[PDB]
Amino acid sequence: AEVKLYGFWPSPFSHRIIWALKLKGVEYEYIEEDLSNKSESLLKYNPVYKKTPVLVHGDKPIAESLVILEYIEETWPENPLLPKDPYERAMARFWIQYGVDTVAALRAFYLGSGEELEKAAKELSECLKILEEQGLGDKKFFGGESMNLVDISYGALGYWLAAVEEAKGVTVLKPSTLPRLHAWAKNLDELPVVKENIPASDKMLAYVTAAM
Numbered sequence: 001a002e003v004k005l006y007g008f009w010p011s012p013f014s015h016r017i018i019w020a021l022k023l024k025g026v027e028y029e030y031i032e033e034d035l036s037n038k039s040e041s042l043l044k045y046n047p048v049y050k051k052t053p054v055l056v057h058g059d060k061p062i063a064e065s066l067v068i069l070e071y072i073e074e075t076w077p078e079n080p081l082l083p084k085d086p087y088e089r090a091m092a093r094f095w096i097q098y099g100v101d102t103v104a105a106l107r108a109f110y111l112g113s114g115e116e117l118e119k120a121a122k123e124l125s126e127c128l129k130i131l132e133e134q135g136l137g138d139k140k141f142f143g144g145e146s147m148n149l150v151d152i153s154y155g156a157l158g159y160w161l162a163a164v165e166e167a168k169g170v171t172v173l174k175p176s177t178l179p180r181l182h183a184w185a186k187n188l189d190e191l192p193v194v195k196e197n198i199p200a201s202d203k204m205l206a207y208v209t210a211a212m
């Protein structure tokens with residue numbers, strides 16, 4: 001208790017938060033929101049955006065996943081999910097901001113069909129190549145030898161992108177073209193903190209298919 005999380009079951013934005021709380025050992029009450037029938041609590045706690053997720057700590061709300069993650073890191077500092085050095089912290093924030101570009105590429109892919117899909121797939125691959133070569137490099141995690149907030153932010157490139165790829169019949173994140181990023185996503189997907197806190201594959205595929 002004392003910590004509440006208003007979430008949406010299939011959303012990586014919500015999953016990210018769960019992962020961070022679990023890595024911090026913070027107990028939370030999870031509240032599932034029906035996005036088509038938003039609770040009064042949700043509208044009250046996030047009047048600007050009226051979206052999930054929303055973390056409430058001591059009756060005070062924090063909205064926007066990226067902001068919530070930073071708040072969790074600063075509020076429960078043990079087991080740091082950001083490094084100490086300002087330059088390395090800036091590189092973490094830089095690659096989290098590149099997540100904006102990645103989300104856009106993922107969106108185009110998710111929405112494409114025909115020639116559009118082919119183009120989107122290609123642009124997503126190019127987006128991920130930059131992330132792999134210049135962000136991840138030869139490190140096991142974006143955080144080096146353990147996960148940091150960048151790993152959390154990109155974790156959806158495993159289970160979630162995999163479900164979208166199955167839905168579209170097109171794989172973008174594949175070992176032959178992105179061997180380091182594919183290995184990273186597979187290793188993250190096998191970590192208990194991730195594996196225990198994502199939806200079952202069938203449910204995840206069923207959701208993204210329906211949405212399409």
Ligand SMILES: N[C@@H](CCC(=O)N[C@@H](CS)C(=O)NCC(=O)O)C(=O)O
Pocket residue numbers: 008011012013035050051052053063064065066
């Ligand atoms: N920028 C937000 C994005 C989260 C988001 O888009 N949430 C969606 C669900 S995945 C939502 O709640 N949409 C509200 C609606 O359908 O009106 C964040 O990172 O937290």
